[PDB]
Amino acid sequence: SQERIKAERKRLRNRIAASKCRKRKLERISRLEEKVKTLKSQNTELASTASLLREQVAQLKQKVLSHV
Amino acid sequence: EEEKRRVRRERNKLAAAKCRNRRRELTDRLQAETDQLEEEKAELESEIAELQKEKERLEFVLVA
Ligand SMILES: *CC(=O)c1ccc(OC)c2c1OCC2=O
Ligand SMILES: [Cl-]
Ligand SMILES: [Cl-]
Numbered sequence: 001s002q003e004r005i006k007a008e009r010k011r012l013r014n015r016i017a018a019s020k021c022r023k024r025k026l027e028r029i030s031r032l033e034e035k036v037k038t039l040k041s042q043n044t045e046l047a048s049t050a051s052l053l054r055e056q057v058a059q060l061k062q063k064v065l066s067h068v
Numbered sequence: 069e070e071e072k073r074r075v076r077r078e079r080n081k082l083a084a085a086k087c088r089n090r091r092r093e094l095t096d097r098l099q100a101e102t103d104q105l106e107e108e109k110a111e112l113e114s115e116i117a118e119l120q121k122e123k124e125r126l127e128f129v130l131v132a
């Protein structure tokens with residue numbers, strides 16, 4: 001009946017709108033969490049190289065200190 | 069009565085507010101984590117820079 005169809009139009013309109021918003025939110029959370037994982041990697045390696053350079057320079061300083 | 073309808077309206081409004089603020093707790097947790105990982109990444113980037121500066125200098129100090 002036109003009244004019933006009315007009720008159903010509004011039900012399956014609000015519901016499909018919710019189904020749009022749900023996806024737009026979850027893809028967002030996903031991106032953010034992938035970027036957190038990506039930075040926590042690009043930091044493990046950056047600190048590897050940083051502390052490696054630290055050891056190398058504390059060695060080269062000693063070479064110079066030995067030849068004077 | 070239809071004031072049950074106004075009550076369901078103004079109730080489920082403020083209840084959807086629940087997951088909106090939960091999503092905000094989660095997304096802003098992530099956003100602050102990320103900001104700070106960026107501050108730290110930047111520190112390391114410039115520290116690598118300065119370290120390599122002084123390393124190449126010491127190397128051209130040994131030979132020269
Ligand atoms: C937060 C909210 O109103 C909402 C809307 C639609 C959903 O179904 C996919 C769900 C929520 O919160 C939890 C959830 O499953
Ligand atoms: Cl509505
Ligand atoms: Cl927001």
Ligand SMILES: [Cl-]
Pocket residue numbers: 096
């Ligand atoms: Cl914010």
